[PDB]
Amino acid sequence: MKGDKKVIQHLNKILGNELIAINQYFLHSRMWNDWGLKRLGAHEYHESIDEMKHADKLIERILFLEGLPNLQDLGKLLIGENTQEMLQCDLNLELKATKDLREAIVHCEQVHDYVSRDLLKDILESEEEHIDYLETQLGLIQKVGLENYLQSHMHE
Amino acid sequence: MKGDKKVIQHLNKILGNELIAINQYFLHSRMWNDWGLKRLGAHEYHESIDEMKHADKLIERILFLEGLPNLQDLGKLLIGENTQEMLQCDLNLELKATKDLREAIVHCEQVHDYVSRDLLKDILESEEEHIDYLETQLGLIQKVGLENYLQSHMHE
Amino acid sequence: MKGDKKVIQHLNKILGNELIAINQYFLHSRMWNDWGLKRLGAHEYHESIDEMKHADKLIERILFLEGLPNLQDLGKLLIGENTQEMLQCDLNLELKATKDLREAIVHCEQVHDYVSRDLLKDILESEEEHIDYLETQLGLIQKVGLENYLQSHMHE
Amino acid sequence: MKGDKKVIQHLNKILGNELIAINQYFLHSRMWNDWGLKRLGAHEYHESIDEMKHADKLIERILFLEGLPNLQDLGKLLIGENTQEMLQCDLNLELKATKDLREAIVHCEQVHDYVSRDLLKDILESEEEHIDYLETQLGLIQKVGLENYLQSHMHE
Amino acid sequence: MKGDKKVIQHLNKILGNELIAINQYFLHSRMWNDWGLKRLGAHEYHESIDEMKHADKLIERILFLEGLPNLQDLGKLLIGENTQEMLQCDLNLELKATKDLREAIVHCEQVHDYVSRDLLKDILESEEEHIDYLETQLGLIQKVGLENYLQSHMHE
Amino acid sequence: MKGDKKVIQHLNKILGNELIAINQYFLHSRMWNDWGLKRLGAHEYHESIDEMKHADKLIERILFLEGLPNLQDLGKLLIGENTQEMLQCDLNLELKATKDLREAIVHCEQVHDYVSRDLLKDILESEEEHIDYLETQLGLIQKVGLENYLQSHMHE
Amino acid sequence: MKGDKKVIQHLNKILGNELIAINQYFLHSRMWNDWGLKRLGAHEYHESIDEMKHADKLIERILFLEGLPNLQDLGKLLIGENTQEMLQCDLNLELKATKDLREAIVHCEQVHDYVSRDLLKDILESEEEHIDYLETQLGLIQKVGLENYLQSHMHE
Ligand code: HEM
Ligand code: HEM
Ligand code: HEM
Ligand SMILES: O=C1NC(=O)c2c(NCc3ccccc3O)cccc21
Ligand SMILES: O=C1NC(=O)c2c(NCc3ccccc3O)cccc21
Ligand SMILES: O=C1NC(=O)c2c(NCc3ccccc3O)cccc21
Ligand SMILES: O=C1NC(=O)c2c(NCc3ccccc3O)cccc21
Ligand SMILES: O=C1NC(=O)c2c(NCc3ccccc3O)cccc21
Ligand SMILES: [Fe+2]
């Protein structure tokens, strides 16, 4: 079904953000596992899987709309050097992602691609849940202290 | 069965205390969940449910006695800004509630409404258990420190 | 995540309507149980519970958006004195509620808070189901007559 | 297998009657559900389903006989405005349907299409069962009164 | 609940499209079964049932909105004479349907009937999945050849 | 445990090849699904998953050896435009991957990193199995013909 | 089967390293248990058991190759006096063990004793996993502090 060219560009932009997040979250997960912070590693792994599933759905929608999904261009990963930075890098990436999602929904609405809009709204709900998680982790580091926060994430 | 006018007024005052407690505990629960302190959130949620069940029983007794349950007037909620204040706000509310329960029981006894007295005694037992929980949490904060106390309440 | 100030005001207004509905439906439920109309009592109880669930989700969203949920201000309860009037009071409240939901959705769309819109849309679907139920009950009273209508609601 | 031309015309006529009945019974069903008369709504829904199944077999038989099933022409639906009228409308349609079935059976018998006759006899048995049901409901309205009759069809 | 007159007209227009599709897909299904292409027949049958379910929900929504569902007017069925043409007829009908769904959604949005919009969006998702299925079948015919395509749809 | 610098460089090169393959195979999988060639789509999905698992193990080994896994640099994806070309693109990528694997094993052996060698040997076994599959598919296209080969991969 | 004299000497040297580790890890395990650090005790016990299993396989291989396993000469145990020292003593022993394993693998390769090489590679994989565990624990002590690290290892 021939899609709107600019819808497809927006979907490829969202997909590109998901592709960054897959790799960024997967590396952060394995860094935390390597450091013995296995509960953080496990949760970050599941965040990475979630982005993989979003990327899948975007690829499928783009192809149905007779566009070419862009898996070639990989933007800049934000890799932290400690737990606090890794969580902040994730949150900064999510805030860009949700900004881009909102602009994509605007355009979908304007050209009446309501199914693409519904897909993006669902992805936006997942990303806002991830923002909730990240903001809460940063708040907990303040409320329980870094040593306790890391201690609470050693064992699964 | 027509009840004593002043019993019904006492029952409505106790009900009013329960209605404040429902909302105060429900908001505190959701604040704690938002902050990532999910074990505190779950326990405060169950305290809110407790008060909902007491309010139900009070409403049922008032109606049986052919009075009008007052769900319209809501007294002042005591909302804290941090964990220790939220617990102390709960405790201050509970101490007012048990004072009001005692005066209501005196009057039920004087006019021989022994069934209303028994209901209020059951509610008073529950409220004294809540006071025990609150005093104990405040004592634990002193013994283990706030950061450890909150750490122990991150995960359900 | 910092929310739009007027979105949060709209959410608190929707929350206020739900808080009214919780108490109005809970009291109507217990009135119907006291009168021996237990099927009405049980159905109205479940309506109250549904409103409690909506209020929970609104509270949770407001906190995520870094607003202050308002559980203190309680608007006017519409309490009926007989079955037809109670249903009509519920219906009047619901029509006020869906008017407010539509205006809140308009504003969420305008500021691109698509997740808040989706939450409100889900709530609007529930409230329109309640309107469907209420309009149908009032119509049944006209079709089968009040005495038969009440008879049919004595037993669950 | 090449069928008799007039058998196919008769089969298309019976099918045309079933297609009217499908839509008339389905709309009456949903009207009754909208009005809270859910036992009538459910029963009328099953009548519509039964006509769908008859239409299926008629379509299958026409095609085996190398005819063209006519799903394009839709005759006049008889939609009532209240329960008595709706039941009488169904009954008027069923009486036309059974007249047409009898004439189709005569013709199948004359050209020795005994399998088509057997199919139509089975459909006629179902339509006479529907007639019994309809006549009985109209009779019950007279015996128990309209208000009781409707009351008895509120709950499934 | 009194709905917008033009929303109801749009809903009846969508319903009219579903009613055409029910009959067109059902006949196509039974043609394919008669020709021994049972996997096509079964899939097309399930497409017809899906349109029946959409029509039900549209009828129910119209009645809730106090309009009159139109099951009387049946538009033009597009019946093919061979497998390729039947698939193209279905696809042509689906493209008209999704064009009409988009216009109805625009109008629901403008009058703030967000629940009708959500229903139509769900139907639109279903119809776009049908378009994907249809476009894919036509493409497979080109890739594997017509004889192989039919061969693969002989047995379920 | 501090690893050999050039081993880590080799591991990152193997990792880089796996990251290309993940995306290349995932996109090919979703293209085949879009085209209705669901058995190829499923098999190619499992190949993509297999490469994801290899990438995970390389990332973990690199971090253990105190290197920085490179998920940022993504080399050139080889995306075909039809089935035969997609298989060949997978095959060309795999032939480069196994050459690089052999060179990495040589160097691991030279510096006595026998665990890294064993990991690379296991990955090489998986890549050679993938080569067996790909060569066999390309040969089957020749033996049964393209139209039959595609037909045989339509349904899972 | 007569083995290479120097392979057997290498195998007896690896065996000697394993025998030290059995006793060192078993004593550390029981010290931690006596101190109430039962999770460290349990983990260290399983490390000791693992070395016992390695020693068993080495003894079996030496006898198959017609050498004499040396269980008489026991090298120097590295027993720490506190948790940090005990972990570092384990790590120092493992680093010596993996150096000796690498030299033995070199010699097995030169004389084509590929089965002995495979046995040693498997032991080396297990010892590098122990190195990973030990390095991670020492890092966790720095990240969460010694008191939290010990607290997390009180209960199994
Ligand atoms: C007049 C005030 C209220 C009364 C009388 C009341 C009564 C009740 C009762 C009797 C239950 C069932 C508990 C059980 O036996 O399991 C319940 C459940 C619940 N209430 Fe309330 N309640 C009130 C207010 C509220 C408010 C203000 C909120 C939230 C803001 C709330 C949230 C809930 C929730 C989330 C549940 C659990 C529902 C479920 O999933 O089953 N309630 N309430
Ligand atoms: C040419 C007209 C039609 C034919 C031949 C037809 C045929 C059928 C058949 C064979 C079934 C399944 C019966 C079974 O379960 O054994 C069915 C189910 C159904 N039909 Fe129809 N039908 C037609 C029109 C309609 C229309 C116009 C509507 C609604 C407005 C409708 C609504 C339904 C529904 C809701 C179901 C149940 C699907 C489910 O299982 O959930 N049908 N139909
Ligand atoms: C550095 C890149 C990636 C790595 C390391 C990686 C790793 C993984 C791993 C370890 C799994 C679990 C496999 C198992 O079941 O054991 C997985 C699953 C999966 N991956 Fe990835 N992956 C990557 C990229 C991607 C991309 C780019 C996509 C799609 C665009 C994707 C889609 C999926 C899906 C759909 C699943 C299964 C999810 C489910 O359980 O439903 N992955 N990945
Ligand atoms: O990242 C990428 N996403 C893609 O589609 C893609 C490529 N596609 C080649 C191609 C072109 C025109 C039509 C069909 C096609 O398969 C080629 C390279 C990279 C990518
Ligand atoms: O309601 C209907 N039933 C049908 O068959 C039909 C149509 N069929 C076209 C056609 C003609 C001649 C031969 C094979 C054919 O498919 C066309 C329109 C409507 C209908
Ligand atoms: O397809 C149809 N949908 C309908 O409602 C309908 C008819 N309705 C009769 C009627 C009119 C005015 C007011 C209430 C009513 O029941 C009559 C014929 C056909 C249809
Ligand atoms: O693809 C990547 N793999 C990585 O490690 C990485 C980055 N690492 C930052 C960094 C440097 C020095 C020390 C610790 C560190 O976390 C930064 C960007 C991209 C990548
Ligand atoms: O630690 C030890 N390992 C051994 O084999 C061993 C002894 N072996 C006695 C013996 C000698 C000559 C030939 C065959 C034999 O069994 C004796 C003492 C200690 C050990
Ligand atoms: Fe602690």
Short mmCIF file of all heavy atoms in Angstrom, two decimals, chain B residues 19 22-23 26 30 45 49 52-53 55-56 59 71, chain C residues 15 19 22-23 26 30 45 49 52-53 55-56 59 71, ligand 1:
data_model
loop_
_atom_site.label_atom_id
_atom_site.label_comp_id
_atom_site.label_asym_id
_atom_site.label_seq_id
_atom_site.Cartn_x
_atom_site.Cartn_y
_atom_site.Cartn_z
N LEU B 19 -12.65 8.58 55.60
CA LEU B 19 -12.58 9.15 54.25
C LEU B 19 -11.32 9.98 54.05
O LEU B 19 -10.70 9.93 52.98
CB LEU B 19 -13.83 9.98 53.98
CG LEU B 19 -15.09 9.14 53.86
CD1 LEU B 19 -16.33 10.02 53.93
CD2 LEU B 19 -15.08 8.32 52.57
N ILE B 22 -8.50 7.33 53.71
CA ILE B 22 -8.50 6.68 52.39
C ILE B 22 -7.66 7.49 51.41
O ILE B 22 -6.72 6.98 50.78
CB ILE B 22 -9.94 6.50 51.87
CG1 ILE B 22 -10.68 5.42 52.65
CG2 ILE B 22 -9.93 6.15 50.43
CD1 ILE B 22 -12.18 5.46 52.42
N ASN B 23 -8.00 8.77 51.26
CA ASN B 23 -7.32 9.57 50.26
C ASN B 23 -5.87 9.85 50.63
O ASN B 23 -4.99 9.83 49.76
CB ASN B 23 -8.08 10.89 50.06
CG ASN B 23 -9.46 10.69 49.38
OD1 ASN B 23 -9.98 9.57 49.31
ND2 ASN B 23 -10.06 11.78 48.94
N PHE B 26 -3.94 6.67 50.07
CA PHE B 26 -3.83 6.34 48.66
C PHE B 26 -2.83 7.26 47.96
O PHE B 26 -2.01 6.79 47.17
CB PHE B 26 -5.19 6.39 47.94
CG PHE B 26 -5.20 5.56 46.69
CD1 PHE B 26 -5.60 4.24 46.72
CD2 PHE B 26 -4.75 6.09 45.48
CE1 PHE B 26 -5.56 3.45 45.55
CE2 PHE B 26 -4.72 5.32 44.34
CZ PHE B 26 -5.12 4.00 44.39
N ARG B 30 0.85 6.13 46.20
CA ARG B 30 1.24 6.38 44.83
C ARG B 30 2.47 7.29 44.74
O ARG B 30 3.27 7.15 43.82
CB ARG B 30 0.04 6.98 44.09
CG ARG B 30 -0.87 5.90 43.42
CD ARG B 30 -1.17 4.69 44.32
NE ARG B 30 -1.82 3.62 43.55
CZ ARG B 30 -1.66 2.32 43.79
NH1 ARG B 30 -0.88 1.91 44.79
NH2 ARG B 30 -2.28 1.43 43.03
N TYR B 45 -0.83 1.22 50.25
CA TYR B 45 -2.03 0.85 49.49
C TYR B 45 -2.94 -0.07 50.31
O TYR B 45 -4.16 0.12 50.35
CB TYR B 45 -1.62 0.17 48.18
CG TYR B 45 -2.77 -0.51 47.43
CD1 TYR B 45 -3.62 0.22 46.61
CD2 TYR B 45 -2.98 -1.90 47.52
CE1 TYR B 45 -4.64 -0.39 45.90
CE2 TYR B 45 -4.03 -2.52 46.82
CZ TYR B 45 -4.85 -1.76 46.02
OH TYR B 45 -5.89 -2.33 45.30
N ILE B 49 -6.84 0.46 51.53
CA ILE B 49 -7.92 -0.52 51.36
C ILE B 49 -8.58 -0.82 52.70
O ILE B 49 -9.81 -0.87 52.79
CB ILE B 49 -7.37 -1.80 50.70
CG1 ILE B 49 -6.83 -1.49 49.29
CG2 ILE B 49 -8.41 -2.92 50.71
CD1 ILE B 49 -7.88 -1.10 48.27
N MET B 52 -10.93 1.87 53.44
CA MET B 52 -12.10 1.70 52.57
C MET B 52 -13.07 0.67 53.14
O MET B 52 -14.29 0.88 53.12
CB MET B 52 -11.65 1.27 51.18
CG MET B 52 -10.89 2.31 50.42
SD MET B 52 -10.27 1.72 48.86
CE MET B 52 -8.85 2.75 48.58
N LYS B 53 -12.55 -0.46 53.65
CA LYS B 53 -13.44 -1.48 54.20
C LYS B 53 -14.13 -1.00 55.48
O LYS B 53 -15.30 -1.33 55.71
CB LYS B 53 -12.67 -2.76 54.47
CG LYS B 53 -12.18 -3.47 53.22
CD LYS B 53 -11.36 -4.71 53.61
CE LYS B 53 -10.81 -5.44 52.41
NZ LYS B 53 -9.84 -6.50 52.84
N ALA B 55 -14.86 2.20 56.10
CA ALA B 55 -15.87 3.17 55.66
C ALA B 55 -17.11 2.45 55.16
O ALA B 55 -18.23 2.87 55.45
CB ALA B 55 -15.31 4.08 54.56
N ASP B 56 -16.92 1.36 54.39
CA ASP B 56 -18.05 0.55 53.93
C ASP B 56 -18.90 0.08 55.09
O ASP B 56 -20.12 0.25 55.10
CB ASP B 56 -17.52 -0.61 53.09
CG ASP B 56 -18.61 -1.45 52.47
OD1 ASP B 56 -19.79 -1.03 52.43
OD2 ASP B 56 -18.28 -2.56 52.03
N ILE B 59 -20.82 3.04 56.64
CA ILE B 59 -21.93 3.41 55.76
C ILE B 59 -23.08 2.44 55.92
O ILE B 59 -24.25 2.84 56.00
CB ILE B 59 -21.44 3.48 54.30
CG1 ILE B 59 -20.47 4.65 54.08
CG2 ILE B 59 -22.63 3.56 53.33
CD1 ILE B 59 -19.68 4.58 52.75
N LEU B 71 -20.71 11.43 52.89
CA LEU B 71 -19.54 11.29 52.03
C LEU B 71 -19.19 12.60 51.34
O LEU B 71 -18.31 12.62 50.48
CB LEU B 71 -19.77 10.19 50.99
CG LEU B 71 -19.64 8.75 51.50
CD1 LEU B 71 -20.87 8.30 52.26
CD2 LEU B 71 -19.34 7.78 50.34
N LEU C 15 -9.85 13.90 37.52
CA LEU C 15 -9.72 13.20 38.79
C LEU C 15 -10.81 13.63 39.76
O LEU C 15 -11.43 12.79 40.42
CB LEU C 15 -8.33 13.44 39.37
CG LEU C 15 -8.06 12.93 40.78
CD1 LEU C 15 -8.37 11.43 40.87
CD2 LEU C 15 -6.60 13.21 41.16
N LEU C 19 -13.50 11.25 41.63
CA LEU C 19 -13.62 11.22 43.09
C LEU C 19 -15.05 11.46 43.53
O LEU C 19 -15.52 10.83 44.50
CB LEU C 19 -12.70 12.26 43.74
CG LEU C 19 -11.21 11.99 43.60
CD1 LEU C 19 -10.41 13.22 44.04
CD2 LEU C 19 -10.81 10.74 44.42
N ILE C 22 -16.91 8.11 42.64
CA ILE C 22 -16.62 7.02 43.58
C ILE C 22 -17.61 7.05 44.74
O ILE C 22 -18.22 6.03 45.09
CB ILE C 22 -15.18 7.11 44.09
CG1 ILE C 22 -14.21 6.71 43.00
CG2 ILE C 22 -15.01 6.26 45.37
CD1 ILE C 22 -12.78 7.14 43.32
N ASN C 23 -17.73 8.20 45.39
CA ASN C 23 -18.56 8.31 46.59
C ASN C 23 -20.04 8.23 46.26
O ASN C 23 -20.83 7.64 47.02
CB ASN C 23 -18.26 9.64 47.31
CG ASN C 23 -16.87 9.65 47.96
OD1 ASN C 23 -16.03 8.83 47.65
ND2 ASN C 23 -16.64 10.60 48.84
N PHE C 26 -20.77 4.66 45.38
CA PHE C 26 -20.65 3.79 46.55
C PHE C 26 -21.85 3.95 47.48
O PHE C 26 -22.36 2.96 48.03
CB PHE C 26 -19.36 4.04 47.33
CG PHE C 26 -18.96 2.84 48.13
CD1 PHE C 26 -18.16 1.87 47.56
CD2 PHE C 26 -19.50 2.62 49.39
CE1 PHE C 26 -17.86 0.70 48.27
CE2 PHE C 26 -19.20 1.48 50.10
CZ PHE C 26 -18.38 0.51 49.53
N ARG C 30 -24.82 1.16 48.40
CA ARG C 30 -25.17 0.72 49.74
C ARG C 30 -26.60 1.06 50.09
O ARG C 30 -27.24 0.33 50.86
CB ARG C 30 -24.19 1.29 50.75
CG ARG C 30 -22.95 0.37 51.00
CD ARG C 30 -22.28 -0.19 49.72
NE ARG C 30 -21.30 -1.24 50.04
CZ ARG C 30 -21.05 -2.31 49.28
NH1 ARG C 30 -21.72 -2.50 48.14
NH2 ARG C 30 -20.15 -3.21 49.68
N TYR C 45 -21.93 -1.07 42.93
CA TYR C 45 -20.64 -1.29 43.57
C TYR C 45 -19.54 -1.42 42.53
O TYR C 45 -18.47 -0.82 42.66
CB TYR C 45 -20.71 -2.54 44.46
CG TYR C 45 -19.36 -3.00 44.98
CD1 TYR C 45 -18.80 -2.43 46.12
CD2 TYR C 45 -18.66 -4.01 44.34
CE1 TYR C 45 -17.55 -2.86 46.60
CE2 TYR C 45 -17.43 -4.44 44.80
CZ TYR C 45 -16.88 -3.85 45.92
OH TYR C 45 -15.66 -4.28 46.38
N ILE C 49 -16.08 0.85 41.89
CA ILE C 49 -14.75 0.26 41.77
C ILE C 49 -14.08 0.68 40.47
O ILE C 49 -12.88 1.01 40.45
CB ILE C 49 -14.83 -1.28 41.87
CG1 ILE C 49 -15.40 -1.71 43.21
CG2 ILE C 49 -13.46 -1.90 41.58
CD1 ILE C 49 -14.49 -1.52 44.39
N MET C 52 -12.79 4.09 40.94
CA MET C 52 -11.59 4.01 41.75
C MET C 52 -10.39 3.66 40.90
O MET C 52 -9.31 4.23 41.08
CB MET C 52 -11.78 2.98 42.86
CG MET C 52 -12.81 3.33 43.91
SD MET C 52 -13.05 1.96 45.09
CE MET C 52 -14.72 2.25 45.66
N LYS C 53 -10.55 2.73 39.96
CA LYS C 53 -9.42 2.35 39.12
C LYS C 53 -9.00 3.50 38.20
O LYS C 53 -7.80 3.75 38.00
CB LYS C 53 -9.78 1.10 38.31
CG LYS C 53 -9.91 -0.19 39.18
CD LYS C 53 -10.35 -1.39 38.32
CE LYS C 53 -10.52 -2.67 39.12
NZ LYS C 53 -11.13 -3.77 38.33
N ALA C 55 -9.39 6.72 38.87
CA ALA C 55 -8.73 7.71 39.71
C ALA C 55 -7.29 7.32 39.97
O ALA C 55 -6.40 8.17 39.99
CB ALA C 55 -9.50 7.89 41.02
N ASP C 56 -7.06 6.03 40.23
CA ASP C 56 -5.71 5.53 40.43
C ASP C 56 -4.83 5.86 39.24
O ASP C 56 -3.73 6.39 39.39
CB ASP C 56 -5.75 4.01 40.69
CG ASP C 56 -4.41 3.42 41.05
OD1 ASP C 56 -3.45 4.17 41.35
OD2 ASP C 56 -4.32 2.16 41.07
N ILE C 59 -4.16 9.68 39.08
CA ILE C 59 -3.18 10.03 40.11
C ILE C 59 -1.78 9.63 39.65
O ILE C 59 -0.84 10.44 39.72
CB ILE C 59 -3.53 9.35 41.44
CG1 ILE C 59 -4.78 9.97 42.01
CG2 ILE C 59 -2.37 9.41 42.43
CD1 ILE C 59 -5.42 9.19 43.11
N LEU C 71 -6.65 15.38 45.85
CA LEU C 71 -7.67 14.54 46.46
C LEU C 71 -8.42 15.28 47.56
O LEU C 71 -9.21 14.67 48.29
CB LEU C 71 -7.02 13.26 47.03
CG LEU C 71 -6.64 12.21 45.98
CD1 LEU C 71 -5.38 12.56 45.26
CD2 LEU C 71 -6.49 10.84 46.64
C1 HEM H 1 -15.85 6.57 49.59
C2 HEM H 1 -14.58 6.19 49.42
C3 HEM H 1 -14.25 4.72 49.11
C4 HEM H 1 -14.87 3.62 49.51
C5 HEM H 1 -16.11 3.49 50.43
C6 HEM H 1 -14.15 2.50 48.93
C7 HEM H 1 -14.44 1.17 49.07
C8 HEM H 1 -13.72 0.16 48.47
C9 HEM H 1 -13.92 -1.26 48.69
C10 HEM H 1 -14.99 -1.84 49.64
C11 HEM H 1 -13.03 -1.91 47.94
C12 HEM H 1 -12.87 -3.44 47.85
C13 HEM H 1 -11.70 -3.85 48.73
C14 HEM H 1 -11.67 -5.35 48.89
O1 HEM H 1 -12.48 -5.90 49.67
O2 HEM H 1 -10.84 -6.00 48.23
C15 HEM H 1 -12.21 -0.93 47.22
C16 HEM H 1 -11.18 -1.20 46.34
C17 HEM H 1 -10.34 -0.28 45.73
N1 HEM H 1 -10.35 1.10 45.90
FE1 HEM H 1 -11.68 2.08 46.99
N2 HEM H 1 -13.10 2.97 48.16
C18 HEM H 1 -13.16 4.35 48.25
C19 HEM H 1 -12.29 5.26 47.70
C20 HEM H 1 -11.24 5.02 46.87
C21 HEM H 1 -10.41 6.03 46.25
C22 HEM H 1 -10.63 7.53 46.53
C23 HEM H 1 -9.49 5.38 45.49
C24 HEM H 1 -8.34 5.82 44.57
C25 HEM H 1 -8.01 7.09 44.37
C26 HEM H 1 -9.75 3.96 45.61
C27 HEM H 1 -9.04 2.96 45.00
C28 HEM H 1 -9.35 1.63 45.10
C29 HEM H 1 -8.70 0.56 44.40
C30 HEM H 1 -7.54 0.77 43.40
C31 HEM H 1 -9.29 -0.60 44.78
C32 HEM H 1 -8.94 -2.02 44.27
C33 HEM H 1 -9.92 -2.34 43.15
C34 HEM H 1 -9.65 -3.70 42.54
O3 HEM H 1 -8.74 -3.81 41.68
O4 HEM H 1 -10.35 -4.66 42.91
N3 HEM H 1 -10.81 3.79 46.46
N4 HEM H 1 -12.68 0.32 47.57
#
